[PDB]
Structure formats: C-alpha cells, structure tokens
Amino acid sequence: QLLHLMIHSLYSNKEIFLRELISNASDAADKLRFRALSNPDLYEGDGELRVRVSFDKDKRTLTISDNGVGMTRDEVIDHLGTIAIGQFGVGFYSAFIVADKVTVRTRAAGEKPENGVFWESAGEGEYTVADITKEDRGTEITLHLREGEDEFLDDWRVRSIISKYSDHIALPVEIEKREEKDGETVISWEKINKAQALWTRNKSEITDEEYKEFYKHIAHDFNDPLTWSHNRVEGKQEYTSLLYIPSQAPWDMWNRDHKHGLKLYVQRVFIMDDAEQFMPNYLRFVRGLIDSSDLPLNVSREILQDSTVTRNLRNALTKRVLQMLEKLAKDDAEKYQTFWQQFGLVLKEGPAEDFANQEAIAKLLRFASTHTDSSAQTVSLEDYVSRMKEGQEKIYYITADSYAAAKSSPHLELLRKKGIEVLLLSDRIDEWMMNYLTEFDGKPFQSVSKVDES
C-alpha cells in the first residue's frame, strides 16, 4: 500500500520535496515583498530575502530556512492538518520519501516572535504542534534523513541537486559554507542561485530546462509544457509576458469552478495568481505570467474586470497564444497533435468568441476526414483546401455523434463519387461551432444531411 503506488507515482523523483519547499520559499518572499511595500516595518531587520540550505552530516539533518512571510498556526494547521500554501503540504509529506522525521518552525510576518509555530511528524500518524518563540521570521524545515539517503549530506551532491531546482528561481538559494579557519569556525553562506526573476532575463540566456522548470513552478504541474513564448513589450503598452501551453489538460478544465488566469506582477511586484481577465475563455488552458508597468500596484480582481488597460493587454496576449500555437504547428507536428488531443475542444469555442482572430483560430483547427479511412483528427483546413477538386467551391462537412455514425452512415455518396473530401465533425460542440465558422479562405462550408430542395 504505502510502498508501491508511490514508489512508482512520486518516489520516481524523490527529490520532489526539494523542488517545492524551495518553490514555496520563492513565493513566501513574493508575498512579503508585496505587504512590505506599503508597510516597511514588516521587514523588521533583514530585508534581503533568501532561502538557506544546510546540513549536519553527524546529526543526519538537512535544513531549508527562508525569511519570507512565514506562517500562522492556523495557516500551518490548515496545510498539515488536512484530515483528522498547497506546495508546502506536498513538499512536507513528500519529504518523507527521503525522511523519517520532518520538522517545521515558523513565525509570521509582523508578529511577536512568541507567536511562532512548531509542527513535527515522524511520518506515521502522530504529529506534534506547539506555540514557540522564533526570533527571525520565515519558515525553517528540518529533515531527518533515512539510512541510505546520505546524498543530502554531501556538499557536492546537495549543491548540484539544489541547482536543478533553483536556476529558474529569483529568490537567492544560499548554501552553508563552513571552513576550518584558525581556532574557531567561520560560517559563511554562498548563493548557488543566479537569482533573477526568470522573465526578466534575456531569452538568449535561458535554458529549456529553466523554462520547463519555471512552468512547473507557477502552474504546479509535474508535466512539462509543450511550448512557450517570452516577450517584452515597450511603448503603448509596457509589460513582459511569458506564456505556456501544457501537454496534459488539468482535471479542473471542464468545470464551472476553474483554475485559470495568468500570474500578475506589477513593476516586478507580485499581485495575485490566476488573473483570469488576461485570457479569453477559449484559452483557459494557457498558463503563464504577465508583469505590467501600466497597472497600479493596488489593482483589484474587481478593477481588472472593468479595466480597459487590461482588456487591451488581454487582446495583445491573445494574439501571442495564437502565434505560439501556429509556430508550434509548423515547427513540431507531433507535439501539436498532442496539443490538439488535449485542448482541441476548448479551442473550438473560439470561432464564436473571438472573431477578430477568426482566421488564425481556424488555421489551428484539425479535423477527421474522408481523405483517410481513419478517425484521426489530423486534417487541417488548409490541407483540405489544397486537395479540393477543380471547380469545387464549398468545404463539405457532416455532423454526427460518432466518427462511425458520420462516416458510412449518411448520404455523401454523390460527393464520394465525385472524389470530394468531407470533414467528419463528431464532437458535441461542432454543431454549435459551425454557426460561426462559415467560410475559410474565401470558400464557404456546407453540411450534407437531409431535407433540402430549392
């Protein structure tokens, strides 16, 4: 039970806990830097945010300490007391793959050090909570390594790993550096981290693993993105965007209770997650961030809804997704087919929602067809067009509930006989979509079906 299912689902990469606590640190710092803008005292001492990693080979413990927003006993109770922010939970329990005891100690931002929180668990089922006095604010996680997990006690190996999960993080990730220097012990801290907000760096110098690690960072997805697009704009609109396209559709995609939007930053200051006013509905699947100069620091989820600057930004961002997608479509056909398998049904509600970009959208669509006796929705409108017979004016299509149903079940033999190709639309939404996508490249569509004799 405990063993198997995970030894294969999560234990795959037992380093997972590490690329989470660090991610949590990179977010706790963000929140703090946002509160402290208008409330300097929160920094109460050190304003140089960083996450520190260190180990005690003798005591067998790895520690990760950050000085960000820290937590409240309620915030803690909430994440670790699940059943009789989110990543912290995953990272915590995920740590047990490599640890038999994980201990947390945190004191909140702007709080009496006497209001610190202490939470511990030896894995199993019994935890330990306690109010305590924590001097420096932030969160500190101490792991007690199991036998055989001594790789997290080797300066080299540990350093190396940490790198793999922070080159994309802006928060400095410092590693302890003791050096036996005359008599006493000189304790230093050097940073492994390049420490610059990813979207801030020049595309030229960002590795693919960095873009990929960064996607998993903001989207909270174990999978890699299919493509992305990094763009910096100046002038009319001044902002920086970095948008992704997953490779697997999230479970909450087909729900009224979403998970969509872009991560919003203003003047490099974090504002909120899931700013849904930035992408139209037919692009719910896009993930990414936007860092605007033209938006106030005090923007409201409410403001963006009636915000013109936002609509303008949304329109611009919309076209980038469409370009990204077409570039993918020409650059790597195999991944686009993946895209289409995961999101084709979401993209089909675009012709009725976005007609300024209708042509573009239509080019990204794929269809099943008579041109191959398979149901592979591999056919593109342009392809269809290129194969039309001389004298053919219309793009023919049939609608049904099944590929099968629409294939040899209708009355398309006249067309078959004339050697004309017929799109075989068979998705629940196709019928509705065809009310808005009425012509492509100057050639109008037309269905086959019953009842019609002028």
Contact residues: a second copy, CB under 8 A: 1-2, 4-15, 57, 82-83, 86-87, 89-90, 93-94, 97, 125, 147-148, 151, 154-157, 159-160, 178-180, 220-223, 248, 250-255, 337, 341, 368, 374-377, 401-405, 407-409, 426-427
Closest separation between CB of residue 110 and a second copy, Å?
29
CB 3, min distance to a second copy, A? 9
Pick between residue 80 and residue 108 the one whose CB is nearest to a second copy: 80
The distance of closest approach from Cβ of residue 48 to a second copy in the complex, given in angstroms and rounded to an integer, is 24
* 3-state secondary structure (DSSP) of residue 56: strand
| Cβ nearer to a second copy, comparing 290 with 425 | 425
CA distance 437 to 348: 10
The set of residues, in sequence order, having a beta carbon less than 8 Å from that of 309 and lying 6+ positions away, is 237, 292, 294, 295
Q: How far is the CB of 32 from a second copy (least distance, A)?
A: 24
Closest distance of CB 348 from a second copy, Å: 14
How far is C-alpha 247 from the geometric centre of its chain's CA atoms?
A: 11
315 annotated as a binding-site residue: no
Minimum CB distance to a second copy smaller for 164 or for 203: 164
Quick one: DSSP state of residue 252? G
Tell me how far apart the alpha carbons of residues 162 and 315 are, in angstroms, rounded to a whole number.
Answer: 38
Edge-to-edge strand list for the sheet holding 439-440:
422-425, 395-399, 443-447, 439-440
Report the alpha-carbon distance of residue 119 to residue 99 in Å, rounded.
Answer: 15
Nearest residue (CB) to a second copy, 220 versus 230: 220
Rounded-to-10 torsion of CA 256, 257, 263, 265 = 100
N-terminal to C-terminal alpha carbon distance within the chain: 69
Least spacing, CB of residue 1 vs a second copy, in Å: 6
Amino acid at 263: K
- Nearest CA-CA partner of 280 in 326, 311, 239: 311
Nearest distance, CB of residue 208 and a second copy, angstroms: 13
The single-letter DSSP state of residue 369 is: B
Task: Quote the least distance from Cβ 78 to a second copy, whole Å.
Answer: 14
The tokens for 426 are 């068979």
The secondary structure of residue 452, as a DSSP letter, is -
Here the tokens at position 7 are 């030894």
Question: Of 384, 319, 328, which Cα lies nearest the Cα of 354?
Answer: 319
Give the nearer residue to a second copy in terms of CB position, either 8 or 236. Answer: 8
Taken in order 9, 15, 18, 19, is the CA torsion positive or negative? Answer: negative
Tokens of 151: 């790789």
* Contact assessment for residue 406 and residue 358, using Cβ atoms and an 8 Å cutoff: no
Rounded least distance, CB 262 to a second copy, Å: 20
Which residue's CB is nearer to a second copy, number 117 or number 379? 379
Annotated binding residue at 231? no
Nearer Cβ to a second copy (221/383): 221
Cα–Cα distance between 76 and 88 in angstroms, integer? 9
For a second copy, the closer of residues 15 and 75 by Cβ is: 15
Kindly state the smallest distance separating residue 6's Cβ from a second copy, in Å.
6
d(CA 28, CA 111): 15
Smaller CB separation from a second copy, 41 or 179: 179
Strand 395-399 vs strand 443-447: parallel, antiparallel, or unpaired? parallel
Residue type, 82: T
- Give the CA distances from residue 16 to residues 162, 206, 219, in Å, rounded to whole numbers and listed in that order: 11, 22, 15
Q: Cβ distance 216 to 295 under 8 Å?
A: no
For CA atoms 381, 387, 390, 396, give the dihedral sign. Answer: negative
The answer on whether 66 is annotated among ligand-binding residues is yes
User: 6 or 272, CB closer to a second copy?
Assistant: 6
Binding positions for ATP are 24, 66, 92, 139, 220
Binding positions are 24, 66, 92, 139, 220
